[PDB]
Design an enzyme around this catalytic site. Sequence first.
Site, mmCIF file in Angstrom:
data_model
loop_
_atom_site.group_PDB
_atom_site.id
_atom_site.type_symbol
_atom_site.label_atom_id
_atom_site.label_comp_id
_atom_site.label_asym_id
_atom_site.label_seq_id
_atom_site.Cartn_x
_atom_site.Cartn_y
_atom_site.Cartn_z
ATOM 1 C CB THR A 267 -1.006 -0.062 1.156
ATOM 2 O OG1 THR A 267 -0.270 -0.056 2.375
ATOM 3 C CG2 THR A 267 -1.868 -1.299 1.081
ATOM 4 C CG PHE A 392 -6.119 5.764 5.262
ATOM 5 C CD1 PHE A 392 -5.041 4.901 5.155
ATOM 6 C CD2 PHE A 392 -5.916 7.094 4.916
ATOM 7 C CE1 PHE A 392 -3.803 5.371 4.726
ATOM 8 C CE2 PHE A 392 -4.677 7.563 4.490
ATOM 9 C CZ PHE A 392 -3.619 6.703 4.410
ATOM 10 C CB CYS A 399 -6.086 2.168 7.323
ATOM 11 S SG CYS A 399 -4.385 1.568 7.211
HETATM 12 C C1 HEM Z 1 -1.276 4.395 2.083
HETATM 13 C C2 HEM Z 1 -1.136 3.301 2.842
HETATM 14 C C3 HEM Z 1 -2.325 2.501 3.230
HETATM 15 C C4 HEM Z 1 -3.592 2.540 2.743
HETATM 16 C C5 HEM Z 1 -4.085 3.347 1.559
HETATM 17 C C6 HEM Z 1 -4.368 1.600 3.485
HETATM 18 C C7 HEM Z 1 -5.753 1.401 3.235
HETATM 19 C C8 HEM Z 1 -6.576 0.612 3.999
HETATM 20 C C9 HEM Z 1 -7.976 0.501 3.840
HETATM 21 C C10 HEM Z 1 -8.765 1.169 2.749
HETATM 22 C C11 HEM Z 1 -8.422 -0.349 4.813
HETATM 23 C C12 HEM Z 1 -9.830 -0.798 5.083
HETATM 24 C C13 HEM Z 1 -10.065 -2.140 4.383
HETATM 25 C C14 HEM Z 1 -11.489 -2.657 4.425
HETATM 26 O O1 HEM Z 1 -12.435 -1.977 4.887
HETATM 27 O O2 HEM Z 1 -11.667 -3.852 3.974
HETATM 28 C C15 HEM Z 1 -7.257 -0.744 5.582
HETATM 29 C C16 HEM Z 1 -7.309 -1.585 6.664
HETATM 30 C C17 HEM Z 1 -6.171 -1.981 7.380
HETATM 31 N N1 HEM Z 1 -4.895 -1.569 7.161
HETATM 32 FE FE1 HEM Z 1 -4.255 -0.314 5.852
HETATM 33 N N2 HEM Z 1 -3.612 1.013 4.445
HETATM 34 C C18 HEM Z 1 -2.363 1.525 4.340
HETATM 35 C C19 HEM Z 1 -1.252 1.220 5.105
HETATM 36 C C20 HEM Z 1 -1.225 0.304 6.136
HETATM 37 C C21 HEM Z 1 -0.120 -0.026 6.963
HETATM 38 C C22 HEM Z 1 1.264 0.561 6.859
HETATM 39 C C23 HEM Z 1 -0.548 -0.972 7.866
HETATM 40 C C24 HEM Z 1 0.222 -1.690 8.911
HETATM 41 C C25 HEM Z 1 1.548 -1.697 8.898
HETATM 42 C C26 HEM Z 1 -1.935 -1.237 7.556
HETATM 43 C C27 HEM Z 1 -2.756 -2.100 8.254
HETATM 44 C C28 HEM Z 1 -4.126 -2.199 8.071
HETATM 45 C C29 HEM Z 1 -4.955 -3.068 8.937
HETATM 46 C C30 HEM Z 1 -4.440 -3.968 10.044
HETATM 47 C C31 HEM Z 1 -6.234 -2.929 8.509
HETATM 48 C C32 HEM Z 1 -7.435 -3.619 9.142
HETATM 49 C C33 HEM Z 1 -7.890 -2.712 10.313
HETATM 50 C C34 HEM Z 1 -9.024 -3.280 11.117
HETATM 51 O O3 HEM Z 1 -10.108 -3.554 10.512
HETATM 52 O O4 HEM Z 1 -8.883 -3.487 12.357
HETATM 53 N N3 HEM Z 1 -2.286 -0.420 6.532
HETATM 54 N N4 HEM Z 1 -6.138 -0.160 5.052
#
Ligand code: HEM
Length: 454
Positions: A267, A392, A399
């Site tokens: 990402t 996010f 996120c």
């Molecule tokens: C620009 C960078 C990033 C973007 C655009 C991004 C985007 C997203 C989005 C859109 C979701 C929601 C997904 C859904 O509803 O199915 C999400 C969930 C998540 N992201 Fe990211 N993410 C990024 C970076 C990261 C990083 C660096 C980490 C960890 C090192 C991470 C960990 C997670 C986790 C663990 C979730 C699930 C959260 C939960 O439901 O408890 N993300 N991300």
Amino acid sequence: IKEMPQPKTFGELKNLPLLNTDKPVQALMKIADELGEIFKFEAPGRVTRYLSSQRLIKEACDESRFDKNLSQALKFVRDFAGDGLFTSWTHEKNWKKAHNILLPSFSQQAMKGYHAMMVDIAVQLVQKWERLNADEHIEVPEDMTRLTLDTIGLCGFNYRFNSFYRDQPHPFITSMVRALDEAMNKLQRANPDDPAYDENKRQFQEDIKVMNDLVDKIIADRKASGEQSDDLLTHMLNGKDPETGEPLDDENIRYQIITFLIAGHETTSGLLSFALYFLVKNPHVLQKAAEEAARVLVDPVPSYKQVKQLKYVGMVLNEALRLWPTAPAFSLYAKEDTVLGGEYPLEKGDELMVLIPQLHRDKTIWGDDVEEFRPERFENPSAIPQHAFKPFGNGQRACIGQQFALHEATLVLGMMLKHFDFEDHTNYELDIKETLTLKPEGFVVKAKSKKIPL
Ligand code: HEM
Ligand SMILES: O=C(COc1ccc(OC(F)(F)F)cc1)N[C@@H](Cc1ccccc1)C(=O)O
């Protein structure tokens, strides 16, 4: 009550063959441009509805009416990311437990602690580009993936992938990339049980075993050494959920680590690649960001406080997320029967897909210049309508990595703009490759050093 449109069908396969392409999100974007803010999409045994308008998405983001659904992509990723935060249902005990334990590890406060490790990797990227010969260019998404993978290894579990020392990936990353490729490829399969997929299934099972074995050994090695490095793995070994009073079990910690490695690899690297793409296509914006970098980053090593003052760089990153949200969709289910936008009745359990890149092109929100790269759109969050900007995701299921990703991306882009001028020497034509995420494929630049010491 309106009848929503549906794209072209293929007899018994309904809409499934529309995903038989290497660029299915961009295909769905084109369908949304033709059909409008909502369309039905059917596969054998599956119906969902693709939302593109802020008018409908603002309702979809009401947590009292809709919860996170696992899209088929996330169901296939769950075969290796388990009940990690990203592939768990909100009602699974391990979701709220891991969320409560990990939220303090991911806060703006926690970023002060990760900053030195982020700088270690950013400096490696800058020294690599400083050391290129005049005849050489930069493979942008390649180098951004080297950076973001190394940052999450070091902040995740005090592990150096040493990506800048390599052409060839780490064995974990070979298996992870191939598992993500099988998960995203299996989506399109009209006949998944065909014997022609037996090798794919065998190799998937082998890649899951590889990721499980190597992460299980990292955890075992850390408990053995007793070392108390200030990383996510320490926080997960020592942390107690305030609600249950329980810690995460070793199997869930493994799923969280796999999840964080997927995110770091897929990402943040996409965001940095798209950001540099838009800056070289928009030289007036590149100049304004480079001026801020020079004015704020007055020390050889950036500090946490200095990154927090790169406000225009922050706006550049948001405007890149607006046009190309690298995680381009999320899925929701109706908690109860409900009516969407006064026109579309849904039943309990009905599914929605949020097509983030189309939300971000809603001209009723952004105006007729919607395709233009203009970071100034982000000067005043109070002037942006509710739920117009969702890179996010939404609410409690947003996120957890957002502050981590933006700290790293702001630091590195600030250092890149401080240390080099860039040239789009090929006049690169945007080609967006789809894995789990969106990235420029084949994006190359030349970087001329401003010769400023580290
Ligand atoms: C620009 C960078 C990033 C973007 C655009 C991004 C985007 C997203 C989005 C859109 C979701 C929601 C997904 C859904 O509803 O199915 C999400 C969930 C998540 N992201 Fe990211 N993410 C990024 C970076 C990261 C990083 C660096 C980490 C960890 C090192 C991470 C960990 C997670 C986790 C663990 C979730 C699930 C959260 C939960 O439901 O408890 N993300 N991300
Ligand atoms: O619309 C999509 C877009 O694919 C992605 C979904 C999530 C995703 O995760 C993340 F956004 F986090 F990167 C990446 C791509 N997927 C749908 C496609 C589909 C498949 C079969 C029948 C009907 C619909 C899905 O995975 O259910």
